[PDB]
């Protein structure tokens, strides 16, 4: 059966995906990360296998692994707004020049990646919906450090591309746009996976602190659930017809676009009516303070996977905030 070689499992993909994989039968995962708390449920699974790793201290730990495997997801990078200005170097060493590394382990041994892109790659880009084929990348200058991290991945893309054009690489890349649903990354975890944007509301509206609209909270942003998302990353794995060889899949529900204040007021809505709401502070307002559309073009998703999102943003709204209030730590 396939091998499944998830790095940074310990979290929002990785434990939707393992989940995922190890209903069907036909799946051996293994799951590299330095902790096990958030995939704890699966340690004892005969199909799953924990390895205790870390792709900026492990090299030969993480060839082997590759090497063993057959398919790799690498899901570690900073994935968090704030630390691209801040940390700009830490971001650039961790998302590109150690994720380098493990894209040129797949080559050397021919392994197929499965690759995180990014919805940042489209930047500012001028086209309605998002075409991972045809859309043109727009950023700012290099003197606005916020686009750092955009770039960083776009060149990861186009050096993917290259050893798939050049080296046979087996490869398909993936654009989540704000996958949200139960187990929610850390805010300052640094793998990919839940839409940081939502999960700070949900922790806003946990902590008592306000929910800041910067510039008014408009720009509008399209979530999917983790069960529509974690399936078509699923059928990428399948791979079925070999479909999504050299491919670029966004993995959006562009009809569940929404602004920052309309998800606020969307989370706020379901938060005063959820039976655990006494247990949390009063909710302390809406602060505006001092990119605008991102919205996935899916015929890819239509063509290699037959994929179509099936949840309704209520249905997302209501599980993703009622998970989290149950399994938050009240002492």
């Known amino acids: 059966r396939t091998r499944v070689l998830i790095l940074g499992v310990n979290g929002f993909i990785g434990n939707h995906l393992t989940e995922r994989l190890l209903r069907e039968d036909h799946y051996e995962v293994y799951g590299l990360d330095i902790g096990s708390d958030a995939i704890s449920r699966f340690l004892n699974h005969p199909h799953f296998h924990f390895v205790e790793g870390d792709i900026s201290i492990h090299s030969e730990w993480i060839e082997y692994h590759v090497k063993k495997c057959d398919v790799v997801l690498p899901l570690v990078a900073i994935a968090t707004p704030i630390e691209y200005t801040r940390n700009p170097l830490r971001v650039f060493e961790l998302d590109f020049e150690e994720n380098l590394r493990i894209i040129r382990y797949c080559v050397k041994y021919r392994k197929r990646i499965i690759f995180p892109?990014?919805?940042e790659v489209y930047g500012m880009c001028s086209?309605?919906?998002?075409?991972?084929?045809?859309?043109?990348?727009?950023?700012?200058?290099?003197?606005?450090?916020?686009?750092?991290?955009?770039?960083?991945?776009?060149?990861?893309?186009?050096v993917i591309w290259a050893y798939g054009e050049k080296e046979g690489l087996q490869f398909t890349l993936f654009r989540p746009f704000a996958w949200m649903g139960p187990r929610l990354d850390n805010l300052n975890a640094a793998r990919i996976g839940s839409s940081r944007a939502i999960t700070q509301l949900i922790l806003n509206l946990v902590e008592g602190s306000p929910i800041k609209l910067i510039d008014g909270g408009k720009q509008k942003r399209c979530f999917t659930d983790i069960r529509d998302g974690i399936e078509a990353l699923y059928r990428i794995i399948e791979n079925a017809g070999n479909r999504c060889d050299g491919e670029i899949i966004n993995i959006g529900n562009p009809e569940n676009e929404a602004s920052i204040e309309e998800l606020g007021e969307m989370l706020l809505a379901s938060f005063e009516k959820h039976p655990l709401r006494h247990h949390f502070p009063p909710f302390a307002g809406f602060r505006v303070v001092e990119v605008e559309h991102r919205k996935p073009s899916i015929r890819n998703a239509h063509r290699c996977l037959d994929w179509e999102p099936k949840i309704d943003m209520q249905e997302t709204i209501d599980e993703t905030l009622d998970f989290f209030l149950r399994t938050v730590d009240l002492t």
């Open 117 to 119: 892109s990014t919805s």
């Open 127 to 158: 086209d309605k919906y998002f075409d991972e084929d045809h859309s043109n990348l727009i950023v700012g200058p290099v003197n606005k450090p916020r686009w750092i991290y955009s770039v960083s991945k776009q060149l990861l893309d186009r």
